[PDB]
Protein backbone atom coordinates (compact mmCIF):
# COMPACT_ATOMS: atom_id res chain seq x y z
CA UNK A 1 0.00 0.00 0.00
CA UNK A 2 0.97 3.38 0.03
CA UNK A 3 0.08 7.09 1.81
CA UNK A 4 -0.22 10.74 0.52
CA UNK A 5 0.87 12.78 2.40
CA UNK A 6 1.75 16.41 1.18
CA UNK A 7 5.52 18.10 1.84
CA UNK A 8 7.18 21.27 1.02
CA UNK A 9 9.63 21.10 -1.87
CA UNK A 10 11.78 23.97 -0.56
CA UNK A 11 14.82 25.09 -2.42
CA UNK A 12 14.83 21.54 -4.63
CA UNK A 13 14.91 20.23 -8.07
CA UNK A 14 17.47 22.48 -11.15
CA UNK A 15 18.90 21.25 -13.30
CA UNK A 16 21.04 22.76 -16.16
CA UNK A 17 18.87 23.20 -18.46
CA UNK A 18 21.68 22.97 -21.24
CA UNK A 19 25.21 21.61 -21.76
CA UNK A 20 26.86 25.22 -22.05
CA UNK A 21 30.00 26.19 -19.63
CA UNK A 22 29.56 29.57 -17.96
CA UNK A 23 31.65 31.12 -15.00
CA UNK A 24 30.96 33.60 -12.52
CA UNK B 1 25.48 -9.98 -60.28
CA UNK B 2 25.77 -13.05 -58.28
CA UNK B 3 27.11 -16.10 -59.91
CA UNK B 4 28.98 -17.64 -57.44
CA UNK B 5 26.81 -18.31 -54.44
CA UNK B 6 23.71 -18.52 -55.58
CA UNK B 7 24.82 -21.42 -58.90
CA UNK B 8 26.40 -24.59 -58.54
CA UNK B 9 27.06 -27.88 -60.51
CA UNK B 10 23.86 -30.06 -60.94
CA UNK B 11 21.70 -26.76 -60.57
CA UNK B 12 19.96 -25.20 -58.11
CA UNK B 13 16.26 -24.35 -57.55
CA UNK B 14 15.90 -22.90 -53.38
CA UNK B 15 14.73 -19.77 -55.03
CA UNK B 16 10.95 -18.83 -55.63
CA UNK B 17 8.87 -16.14 -56.92
CA UNK B 18 5.08 -15.93 -57.35
CA UNK B 19 3.61 -14.93 -61.42
CA UNK B 20 -0.39 -16.18 -60.62
CA UNK B 21 -1.88 -13.79 -57.29
CA UNK B 22 -5.58 -12.54 -57.01
CA UNK B 23 -4.55 -9.14 -57.22
CA UNK B 24 -1.59 -6.20 -57.77
CA UNK B 25 0.70 -5.91 -54.48
CA UNK B 26 0.54 -2.74 -52.70
CA UNK B 27 4.02 -1.32 -52.56
CA UNK B 28 6.18 -2.00 -49.62
CA UNK B 29 3.55 -5.52 -49.18
CA UNK B 30 4.54 -8.83 -48.00
CA UNK B 31 2.10 -12.04 -49.89
CA UNK B 32 3.72 -15.17 -48.63
CA UNK B 33 1.02 -17.81 -49.28
CA UNK B 34 0.71 -21.37 -50.93
CA UNK B 35 -2.69 -20.54 -52.31
CA UNK B 36 -3.31 -22.25 -55.84
CA UNK B 37 -4.69 -20.06 -58.22
CA UNK B 38 -8.58 -19.99 -59.41
CA UNK B 39 -9.22 -20.68 -63.26
CA UNK B 40 -12.75 -20.67 -64.41
CA UNK B 41 -15.41 -21.68 -61.52
CA UNK B 42 -13.41 -24.38 -59.97
CA UNK B 43 -13.10 -24.92 -56.23
CA UNK B 44 -9.80 -26.47 -56.73
CA UNK B 45 -7.01 -26.92 -54.50
CA UNK B 46 -4.29 -28.92 -56.25
CA UNK B 47 -2.08 -28.79 -58.98
CA UNK B 48 -2.16 -29.15 -62.76
CA UNK B 49 -4.50 -28.26 -65.54
CA UNK B 50 -6.69 -24.86 -64.31
CA UNK B 51 -5.10 -25.60 -60.92
CA UNK B 52 -1.54 -23.61 -60.51
CA UNK B 53 0.90 -23.43 -57.77
CA UNK B 54 0.81 -19.40 -56.56
CA UNK B 55 4.74 -19.66 -56.63
CA UNK B 56 7.78 -20.54 -59.54
CA UNK B 57 11.25 -20.80 -58.93
CA UNK B 58 14.11 -18.76 -60.37
CA UNK B 59 16.53 -22.17 -60.77
CA UNK B 60 20.33 -21.08 -61.16
CA UNK B 61 22.93 -22.48 -62.77
CA UNK B 62 26.29 -21.16 -63.50
CA UNK B 63 25.52 -21.20 -67.28
CA UNK B 64 23.13 -18.50 -68.18
CA UNK B 65 22.77 -15.28 -70.31
CA UNK B 66 23.35 -12.12 -68.74
CA UNK B 67 19.17 -11.44 -68.51
CA UNK B 68 19.27 -15.19 -66.84
CA UNK B 69 22.08 -14.26 -63.88
CA UNK B 70 21.01 -14.16 -60.68
CA UNK B 71 21.62 -10.04 -59.44
CA UNK B 72 21.76 -9.48 -55.89
CA UNK B 73 19.33 -6.80 -55.56
CA UNK B 74 19.62 -4.67 -52.42
CA UNK B 75 17.12 -1.33 -52.23
CA UNK B 76 17.55 1.18 -49.72
CA UNK B 77 14.28 3.38 -48.35
CA UNK B 78 14.66 6.70 -46.58
CA UNK B 79 12.43 8.38 -44.58
CA UNK B 80 13.61 12.11 -45.18
CA UNK B 81 10.19 13.58 -43.43
CA UNK B 82 10.30 16.30 -39.88
CA UNK B 83 11.33 14.01 -37.61
CA UNK B 84 14.34 12.82 -35.12
CA UNK B 85 17.42 12.06 -37.14
CA UNK B 86 19.18 8.66 -36.10
CA UNK B 87 20.83 7.26 -39.03
CA UNK B 88 22.78 9.35 -41.06
CA UNK B 89 26.52 10.40 -42.70
CA UNK B 90 29.96 9.93 -41.85
CA UNK B 91 30.90 13.38 -40.64
CA UNK B 92 34.42 13.54 -41.07
CA UNK B 93 36.98 15.42 -38.63
CA UNK B 94 40.31 16.85 -39.63
CA UNK B 95 43.56 18.58 -37.74
CA UNK B 96 43.44 21.19 -35.08
CA UNK B 97 46.24 23.54 -35.89
CA UNK B 98 46.69 25.73 -32.82
CA UNK B 99 47.33 29.24 -32.50
CA UNK B 100 46.23 30.32 -35.68
CA UNK B 101 43.33 32.00 -37.04
CA UNK B 102 41.56 28.85 -39.16
CA UNK B 103 37.59 28.00 -39.90
CA UNK B 104 36.41 25.60 -37.56
CA UNK B 105 32.71 23.54 -37.37
CA UNK B 106 33.23 21.59 -34.35
CA UNK B 107 30.43 19.00 -33.76
CA UNK B 108 27.82 21.07 -36.28
CA UNK B 109 29.03 24.92 -34.84
CA UNK B 110 30.99 27.15 -37.60
CA UNK B 111 32.83 30.09 -36.49
CA UNK B 112 36.29 31.69 -37.47
CA UNK B 113 39.41 32.44 -35.21
CA UNK B 114 42.06 31.03 -33.13
CA UNK B 115 41.86 28.00 -30.82
CA UNK B 116 44.86 26.74 -28.17
CA UNK B 117 44.70 25.26 -24.86
CA UNK B 118 42.80 26.29 -22.01
CA UNK B 119 42.32 25.81 -18.13
CA UNK B 120 38.40 25.10 -17.72
CA UNK B 121 37.01 23.11 -15.43
CA UNK B 122 34.24 21.52 -17.75
CA UNK B 123 32.24 19.32 -16.12
CA UNK B 124 31.57 16.29 -18.32
CA UNK B 125 28.33 16.07 -19.35
CA UNK B 126 29.50 19.67 -20.88
CA UNK B 127 29.93 20.74 -24.46
CA UNK B 128 29.90 24.24 -25.07
CA UNK B 129 30.98 27.57 -23.54
CA UNK B 130 30.04 30.77 -23.64
CA UNK B 131 29.87 34.25 -21.72
CA UNK B 132 27.63 36.67 -19.91
CA UNK B 133 26.32 38.25 -23.51
CA UNK B 134 26.26 34.25 -25.20
CA UNK B 135 28.76 33.89 -27.49
CA UNK B 136 30.33 30.94 -27.95
CA UNK B 137 34.00 31.17 -26.03
CA UNK B 138 35.03 27.66 -25.36
CA UNK B 139 34.74 24.73 -27.53
CA UNK B 140 35.77 20.77 -25.91
CA UNK B 141 37.43 18.70 -28.63
CA UNK B 142 35.04 15.73 -29.39
CA UNK B 143 37.78 13.09 -30.76
CA UNK B 144 40.38 14.59 -27.48
CA UNK C 1 12.30 13.54 -16.87
CA UNK C 2 10.36 15.84 -19.88
CA UNK C 3 9.85 15.22 -23.58
CA UNK C 4 10.16 18.59 -24.97
CA UNK C 5 9.72 17.82 -28.54
CA UNK C 6 10.45 13.71 -27.92
CA UNK C 7 14.00 13.71 -26.98
CA UNK C 8 13.62 12.00 -23.82
CA UNK C 9 15.61 13.71 -20.82
CA UNK C 10 16.51 12.05 -17.69
CA UNK C 11 18.76 14.10 -15.22
CA UNK C 12 20.15 12.27 -12.13
CA UNK C 13 22.25 13.58 -9.17
CA UNK C 14 22.97 11.62 -5.94
CA UNK C 15 23.06 12.57 -2.53
CA UNK C 16 24.42 10.93 0.96
CA UNK C 17 21.66 13.30 2.72
CA UNK C 18 22.26 14.59 6.09
CA UNK C 19 19.90 13.48 9.00
CA UNK C 20 16.90 14.76 7.90
CA UNK C 21 15.24 13.06 4.65
CA UNK C 22 14.31 15.86 2.09
CA UNK C 23 17.19 18.54 2.41
CA UNK C 24 17.33 22.18 1.62
CA UNK C 25 20.48 22.50 0.49
CA UNK C 26 21.12 23.05 -2.58
CA UNK C 27 21.89 20.12 -5.10
CA UNK C 28 22.87 20.75 -9.09
CA UNK C 29 21.36 18.04 -11.14
CA UNK C 30 23.01 17.07 -14.16
CA UNK C 31 22.20 14.99 -17.50
CA UNK C 32 22.35 11.81 -18.14
CA UNK C 33 21.20 10.37 -21.56
CA UNK C 34 19.01 11.96 -23.94
CA UNK C 35 17.08 9.88 -26.92
CA UNK C 36 14.70 10.07 -29.54
CA UNK C 37 11.84 8.51 -27.97
CA UNK C 38 8.73 11.02 -29.80
CA UNK C 39 5.59 9.29 -28.33
CA UNK C 40 2.21 10.61 -26.58
CA UNK C 41 4.11 10.13 -22.48
CA UNK C 42 0.81 10.87 -20.71
CA UNK C 43 0.87 8.42 -17.85
CA UNK C 44 3.28 7.46 -15.62
CA UNK C 45 4.18 4.39 -13.17
CA UNK C 46 7.13 2.84 -10.98
CA UNK C 47 8.70 -0.50 -10.46
CA UNK C 48 8.99 -2.17 -7.13
CA UNK C 49 11.40 -4.24 -5.96
C1 LIG D 1 1.00 22.78 -0.01
O1 LIG D 1 1.96 22.67 1.00
C2 LIG D 1 1.88 23.66 2.04
C3 LIG D 1 2.07 22.93 3.35
O2 LIG D 1 2.54 21.60 3.14
C4 LIG D 1 0.57 24.47 1.99
O3 LIG D 1 0.71 25.58 1.11
C5 LIG D 1 -0.66 23.64 1.63
O4 LIG D 1 -1.19 23.02 2.80
C6 LIG D 1 -0.37 22.57 0.58
N1 LIG D 1 -1.39 22.58 -0.46
C7 LIG D 1 -2.26 21.58 -0.64
C8 LIG D 1 -2.12 20.42 0.29
O5 LIG D 1 -3.11 21.61 -1.52
C1 LIG E 1 38.71 7.99 -31.40
O1 LIG E 1 38.65 6.80 -32.20
C2 LIG E 1 39.93 6.28 -32.56
C3 LIG E 1 39.69 5.09 -33.46
O2 LIG E 1 39.79 3.87 -32.73
C4 LIG E 1 40.73 5.93 -31.31
O3 LIG E 1 42.04 5.51 -31.69
C5 LIG E 1 40.82 7.13 -30.38
O4 LIG E 1 41.45 6.76 -29.16
C6 LIG E 1 39.43 7.69 -30.09
N1 LIG E 1 39.52 8.87 -29.25
C7 LIG E 1 38.55 9.23 -28.40
C8 LIG E 1 38.80 10.48 -27.61
O5 LIG E 1 37.52 8.58 -28.28
C1 LIG F 1 2.43 11.89 -30.52
O1 LIG F 1 3.81 11.94 -30.91
C2 LIG F 1 4.00 12.17 -32.32
C3 LIG F 1 5.49 12.10 -32.57
O2 LIG F 1 5.88 12.96 -33.64
C4 LIG F 1 3.39 13.52 -32.71
O3 LIG F 1 3.53 13.70 -34.11
C5 LIG F 1 1.92 13.56 -32.32
O4 LIG F 1 1.39 14.86 -32.58
C6 LIG F 1 1.75 13.22 -30.84
N1 LIG F 1 0.33 13.18 -30.49
C7 LIG F 1 -0.39 14.27 -30.21
C8 LIG F 1 -1.83 14.04 -29.87
O5 LIG F 1 0.11 15.39 -30.21
Not at chain 2, 107 to 119: F, Q, R
Not at chain 3, 7 to 15: L, V
Amino acid sequence: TTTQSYTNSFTRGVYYPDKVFRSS
Amino acid sequence: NSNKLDSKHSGNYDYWYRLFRKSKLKPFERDISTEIYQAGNKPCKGKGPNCYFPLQSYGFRPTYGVGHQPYRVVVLSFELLHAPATVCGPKKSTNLVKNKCVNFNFNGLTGTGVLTKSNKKFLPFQQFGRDIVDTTDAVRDPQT
Amino acid sequence: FKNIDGYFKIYSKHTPIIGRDFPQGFSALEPLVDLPIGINITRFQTLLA
